[PDB]
Amino acid sequence: DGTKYIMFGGKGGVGKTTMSAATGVYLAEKGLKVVIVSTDPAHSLRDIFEQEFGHEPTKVKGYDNLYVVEIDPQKAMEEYKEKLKAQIEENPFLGEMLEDQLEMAALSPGTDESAAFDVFLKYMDSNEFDVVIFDTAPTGHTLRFLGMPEVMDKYMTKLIKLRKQMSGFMKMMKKLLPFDYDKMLEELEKMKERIVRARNILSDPERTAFRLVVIPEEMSILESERAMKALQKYGIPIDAVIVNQLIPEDVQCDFCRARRELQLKRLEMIKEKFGDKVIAYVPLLRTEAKGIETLKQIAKILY
Amino acid sequence: DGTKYIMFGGKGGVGKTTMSAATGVYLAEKGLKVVIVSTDPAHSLRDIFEQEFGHEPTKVKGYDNLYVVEIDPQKAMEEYKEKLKAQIEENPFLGEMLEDQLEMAALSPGTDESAAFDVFLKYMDSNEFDVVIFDTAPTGHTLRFLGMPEVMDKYMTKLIKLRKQMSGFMKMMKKLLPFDYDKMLEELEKMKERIVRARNILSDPERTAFRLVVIPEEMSILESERAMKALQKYGIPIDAVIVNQLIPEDVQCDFCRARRELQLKRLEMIKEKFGDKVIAYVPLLRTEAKGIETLKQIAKILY
Amino acid sequence: DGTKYIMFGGKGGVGKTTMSAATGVYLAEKGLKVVIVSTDPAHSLRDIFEQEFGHEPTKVKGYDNLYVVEIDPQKAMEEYKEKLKAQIEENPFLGEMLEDQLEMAALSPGTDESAAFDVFLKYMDSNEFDVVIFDTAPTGHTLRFLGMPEVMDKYMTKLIKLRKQMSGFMKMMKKLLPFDYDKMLEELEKMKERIVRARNILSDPERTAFRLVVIPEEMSILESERAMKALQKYGIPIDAVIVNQLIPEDVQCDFCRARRELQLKRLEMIKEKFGDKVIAYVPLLRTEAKGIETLKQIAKILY
Amino acid sequence: DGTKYIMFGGKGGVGKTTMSAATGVYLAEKGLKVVIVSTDPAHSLRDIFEQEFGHEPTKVKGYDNLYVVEIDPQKAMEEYKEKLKAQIEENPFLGEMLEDQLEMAALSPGTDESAAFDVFLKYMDSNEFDVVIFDTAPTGHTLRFLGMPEVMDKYMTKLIKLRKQMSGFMKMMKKLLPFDYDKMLEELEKMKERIVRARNILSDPERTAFRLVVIPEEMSILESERAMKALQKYGIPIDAVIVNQLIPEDVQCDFCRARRELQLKRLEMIKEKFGDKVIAYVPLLRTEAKGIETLKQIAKILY
Ligand SMILES: Nc1ncnc2c1ncn2[C@@H]1O[C@H](COP(=O)(O)OP(=O)(O)O)[C@@H](O)[C@H]1O
Ligand SMILES: Nc1ncnc2c1ncn2[C@@H]1O[C@H](COP(=O)(O)OP(=O)(O)O)[C@@H](O)[C@H]1O
Ligand SMILES: Nc1ncnc2c1ncn2[C@@H]1O[C@H](COP(=O)(O)OP(=O)(O)O)[C@@H](O)[C@H]1O
Numbered sequence A, B, C, D: 001d002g003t004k005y006i007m008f009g010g011k012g013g014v015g016k017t018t019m020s021a022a023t024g025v026y027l028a029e030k031g032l033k034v035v036i037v038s039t040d041p042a043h044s045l046r047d048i049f050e051q052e053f054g055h056e057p058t059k060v061k062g063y064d065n066l067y068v069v070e071i072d073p074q075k076a077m078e079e080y081k082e083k084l085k086a087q088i089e090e091n092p093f094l095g096e097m098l099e100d101q102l103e104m105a106a107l108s109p110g111t112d113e114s115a116a117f118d119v120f121l122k123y124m125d126s127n128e129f130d131v132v133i134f135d136t137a138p139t140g141h142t143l144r145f146l147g148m149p150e151v152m153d154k155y156m157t158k159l160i161k162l163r164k165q166m167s168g169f170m171k172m173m174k175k176l177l178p179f180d181y182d183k184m185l186e187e188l189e190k191m192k193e194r195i196v197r198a199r200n201i202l203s204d205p206e207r208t209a210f211r212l213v214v215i216p217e218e219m220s221i222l223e224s225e226r227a228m229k230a231l232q233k234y235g236i237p238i239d240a241v242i243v244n245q246l247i248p249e250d251v252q253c254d255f256c257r258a259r260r261e262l263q264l265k266r267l268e269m270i271k272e273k274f275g276d277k278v279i280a281y282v283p284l285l286r287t288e289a290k291g292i293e294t295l296k297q298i299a300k301i302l303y
């Protein structure tokens, strides 16, 4: 088996980023070559491991086999601006215009999320990593493109018809009046296949493990439940739910007691909705979840 | 004064969505007509107010003046597919092709974030709402487009030169051989102005209040600090920081005591970094922050 | 009445060019401001008047009011290459490319005949000349474009439908994702009108006199007859036929006698086919038809 | 040797069409398979051979090996309109539009001359004919496109540069933003080669004989001299000049004597200017040059 994919998702700020770091560590404990890929422009991972990372995979300190890759459209952008600037030298006018268009792209809202997309696909076709752990929160909408290939197929057929009708007209035009679709079709197909390979790898349990992270709070439970549902529609298996920031059993003050009782209610809720799934529990730490120490500790708690 | 804009941002899951709902309620308490606009595909607000919302503003129950708008590119999409399907009737072939292209857009990653962008601009040019509260997390990168206008200006000038050189050539082509830019420039300018109006309204304190939400945890404090900085570079004023999920003073078990001590450290950190700003504090509730009751309560606590 | 148009056509080498020059002279005899416009790249007129002419109207020597304009796509071309070269200076790369495309146009076969077309239309919309005499041989096919307006009309309507269907689609494209026909329709209409004004002026006897030149030879008679027919289909009136190079009555040698007899047969043919039209006869000169002397003489013979 | 090309040019109405028909006959006399190709929309050849011809080669009556092809853009057009109308059936809207655009082409002035061009090229790449005789008057300007290949080369190189700079940018946009020249270059090259093969065949004496036809009149002599010069600049050899419509030596009336004296002057002129070339003389017939009889007679006179 070439490469295995784990990915963590769930509501905002529940430990997606924390669990993926801890899983990275644990899987690195067994000798395995693991990369964690992060779309946080927040660059959460920096704050966790207490180390700088880049758009090119970096070894986490202490580990030869743990890497983190943080997608930064802007950096790779500027690198490319400097590079293209050399090519354009024959033509400053075209060159400055292309520079401008580039920048304009870079600043437009969609484009940051689609840098992420391109990276995602590059790592879905990749080898050289035993395990790739996607930190970036998938959802029904984030993965909505897996439905793309079918539409792409329809559209491609319409294009094919169109190409045939044009080719008849154009030839006559050239003959009578002196003096494209292949390219468009090629691109469409290339992408269609990339996405199809991806959808097959994610929809296959052997290769990819999707994991949901929740808090004992109605909100996280409900979001992550809906998520489970959309994903269930794509074919993506969810092997596990991880409850996190559980208040531990030894609590005394009226406060902790109260919040813990509420948490137990929500744990009945979780056990109800996701109960058909493996559920792991993680407690709320006295310390913040920060060091590689507390990380190894968390990983141990998960296993 | 026509319309006022409040917007909350800060790390993932710190209470952006919660504070904006509570501010919505409080501002509605004083008779005021307030809309909360949400880019969460999570649809958090549904879970908070315990009510369904749509891409068209909906009254929160019990309130004539409180509305929630949830941007859903997909819904407005399908509405439009059904609509366009009627226009295309003369030409199924072109019609089906346009349908396809549409769907392909919809599924592409960027496009979801730019639906949000379009709505944002529509509400920036809008009246009819006394207060518009943006729930969607702005950051340096989410607002990076406010720098667009200037690049747009450069590019527009290059386009103007180009138009003049083409018109000389084209005229000659037409006479010598039988047998665009105005449109492009018009669009560019239209958008440039929209964004400039927006940048002026957000950079103006009288009109827009930007608010940061943090947890006493090194991570949220650091993110929201960087955010503060990027925003400070656009000219966007940050009038207030709201610390949230503060463990209250009455705590007994060793656990709460420990976490509270840590929080107090981080409160010295917040007081340090944002201290030049107004800081409001909110406690961690025994109950989940859910009902309109606990919402009015939170609002009261904020004021 | 603003401007009057005479035009001569008929087989190759029958005196189109000769009769137009003589008509130019005669009409200039009565004080009248007359321009002869010539598409011969042969530049026949130079050889007739024994003088150089250019793409800008030139006074024939001895006459303030007689001008000749010889359309030379190539000259006006080079003039324009030199001019455009100054505009492109900011961008040599775009500039040299445009230069190349221009030259490529210039050398392509159609383009020489359409330079003629453009001039023709410029003089059809013109004032400042009492009489414009087109030397260039019209025929059914040379004037076939007068039927253009109607097709242009159909096509325009299809374009209008198309524009409406696009505007519905493009409009959503922009909102969903960031970030022509008016121009095409404007051009189409501009030309359609130009051609319609033209067809109305030529189809009008008061304004334009179409004249056919023949030799007493089966060939010229047949060509010019077919010409008469196509033209009759456009609504173009043919006011006169001019038989030319008639062998005079005083002839002696068996040779002249023979050819003259043949000519008289063909004159019965002409009188038969065109008889419903005014027919003028011109004899075959002992001298070549060259000088302004023989020209005034010919004109006198015509009137 | 595959195919040989003869082509006759000279002033309007000097016997281009007559000499080419006579050469056709003579070459067919020796068993040889000869086609005459005519761009006259006049359809002169019909009048000569007294027979109908079409855009597909037709045997001249009495001859298996003598064909005439008359290029008629309009006929081949209508044939094609009827054909395309069947293909478009799935889409009337696109179909009618294409029909319209076609007609518009057909009526446009250039397009008739370029139909001729296309045919010319088809017969330059052709076999199946021992001898192809081009009736259509070449000149410096009619053949001016033979200079096209070099400009085509320059432009192609600019295109190549452009293609490389686009491919860098395009790849980057696809990757950053979800989600032609090959075709243009292919066409350019295809045509460039076609024209180069042509220019090599015409510039080669072994394969192609260019022949100039004149009248003993200053005009024809001057035109055909300039023609000789432009052609000499393309590398096209002119093997022969044919003086035509020479008044014979037996003449009596003062008239014939006069015109003949003038002709002898112009014959000194021809002998002067073209004297370095083979010159054949043809007399002015008592009969019109019409029947296949007088044609065989003329051919005998040429040989
Ligand atoms: N068990 C835990 N005890 C204490 N803090 C935790 C625990 N799990 C997560 N956290 C903290 O919650 C915050 C956000 O979680 P995180 O996974 O980083 O966000 P996201 O899921 O939005 O990337 C971090 O400060 C993290 O250290
Ligand atoms: N003062 C509080 N006490 C208890 N829970 C809170 C408090 N403030 C926020 N929360 C809870 O934190 C979770 C996420 O915060 P939220 O603002 O709702 O998300 P986002 O910030 O991404 O829109 C929710 O489950 C919410 O109820
Ligand atoms: N009456 C005439 N006597 C002798 N030659 C004539 C007469 N009329 C015309 N020609 C000659 O016929 C030849 C070509 O005719 P022309 O009409 O000038 O060419 P085109 O019609 O193609 O421009 C010239 O030599 C011209 O001078």
Ligand SMILES: Nc1ncnc2c1ncn2[C@@H]1O[C@H](COP(=O)(O)OP(=O)(O)O)[C@@H](O)[C@H]1O
Residues within 6 Å of the ligand: C012, C013, C217, C218, C219, C220, D011, D012, D013, D014, D015, D016, D017, D018, D019, D044, D244, D245, D246, D282, D283, D284, D285, D286, D287, D288, D289, D290
């Ligand atoms: N030797 C000749 N004697 C008499 N008439 C001739 C002679 N040669 C050509 N002609 C006549 O000249 C006229 C036109 O010549 P043609 O070659 O058809 O025109 P083009 O050269 O413009 O195609 C015809 O009437 C033709 O019969």
Ligand SMILES: [Mg+2]
Residues within 6 Å of the ligand: A016, A017, A018, A040, A044, A135
């Ligand atoms: Mg995260």
Ligand SMILES: [Mg+2]
Residues within 6 Å of the ligand: A012, B016, B017, B018, B040, B044
């Ligand atoms: Mg939220």
Ligand SMILES: [Mg+2]
Residues within 6 Å of the ligand: C016, C017, C018, C040, C044, C135
């Ligand atoms: Mg002429």
Ligand SMILES: [Mg+2]
Residues within 6 Å of the ligand: D016, D017, D018, D040, D044
């Ligand atoms: Mg001819």
Ligand SMILES: [Zn+2]
Residues within 6 Å of the ligand: A251, A252, A253, A255, A256, A257, B251, B252, B253, B255, B256, B257
């Ligand atoms: Zn406690």
Ligand SMILES: [Zn+2]
Residues within 6 Å of the ligand: C251, C252, C253, C254, C255, C256, C257, D251, D252, D253, D255, D256, D257
């Ligand atoms: Zn005589």
